[PDB]
Amino acid sequence: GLYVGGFVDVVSCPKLELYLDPDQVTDYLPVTEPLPITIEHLPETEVGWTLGLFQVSHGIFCTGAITSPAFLELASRLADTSHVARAPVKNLPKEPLLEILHTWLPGLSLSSIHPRELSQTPSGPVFQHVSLCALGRRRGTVAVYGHDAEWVVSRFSSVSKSERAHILQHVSSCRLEDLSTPNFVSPL
Numbered sequence: 001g002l003y004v005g006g007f008v009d010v011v012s013c014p015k016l017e018l019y020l021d022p023d024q025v026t027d028y029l030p031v032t033e034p035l036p037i038t039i040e041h042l043p044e045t046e047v048g049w050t051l052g053l054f055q056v057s058h059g060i061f062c063t064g065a066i067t068s069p070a071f072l073e074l075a076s077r078l079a080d081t082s083h084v085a086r087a088p089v090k091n092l093p094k095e096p097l098l099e100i101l102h103t104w105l106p107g108l109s110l111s112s113i114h115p116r117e118l119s120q121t122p123s124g125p126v127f128q129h130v131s132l133c134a135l136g137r138r139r140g141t142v143a144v145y146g147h148d149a150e151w152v153v154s155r156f157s158s159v160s161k162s163e164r165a166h167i168l169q170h171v172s173s174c175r176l177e178d179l180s181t182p183n184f185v186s187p188l
């Protein structure tokens, strides 16, 4: 069980593309229904689920859980045994897993439909998934990975106490065990 949090970039047709202003989608927030957490908008890389997308003072904040056993075990092995994975991280970190995810997947990209379908009334869901990304971070903040949801939200000074309380209310109400098993498979 691993938690992630941070401010997101809102992209439409990712890697195909248009970055959106957070205000173009605030009318459709919050989103407390689980959305899949994938990697670089790739299919079959679901590693977890969103626990809440909230509009706060300085943009759209995301809190999610990384639940894929295959991904956690693979990432943990690389963090403990790979000189390449540890090259861009400070020497001898206490939590090599967290620091490596923090360094290699800093971006949280929120997938969305085209804006031309938002000015009108959208027919279907506006958001498709959130992605951990190695590139493309603009307005978003570097994703924070940790073991306690409260600890993750604490690392962001851009979130007031009242906001933080609103987040943990919807995060604490979600049990990670009731979530579906992500479909991630190791591409090794």
Ligand SMILES: O=C(O)c1ccc(NC(=O)c2cccc(CC3CCCCC3)n2)c(Nc2cccc(OC(F)(F)F)c2)c1
Binding pocket: 039, 045, 071, 074, 075, 078, 085, 100, 101, 104, 105, 134, 186, 187, 188
């Ligand atoms: O076999 C191949 O041809 C193949 C070769 C390399 C791949 N990855 C990269 O080039 C790449 C680049 C930057 C970041 C990441 C993700 C982190 C994950 C934590 C550990 C550090 C790396 N991956 C992938 N694609 C890939 C898909 C999803 C996850 C992933 O990481 C892992 F496989 F380790 F889970 C790699 C595939």
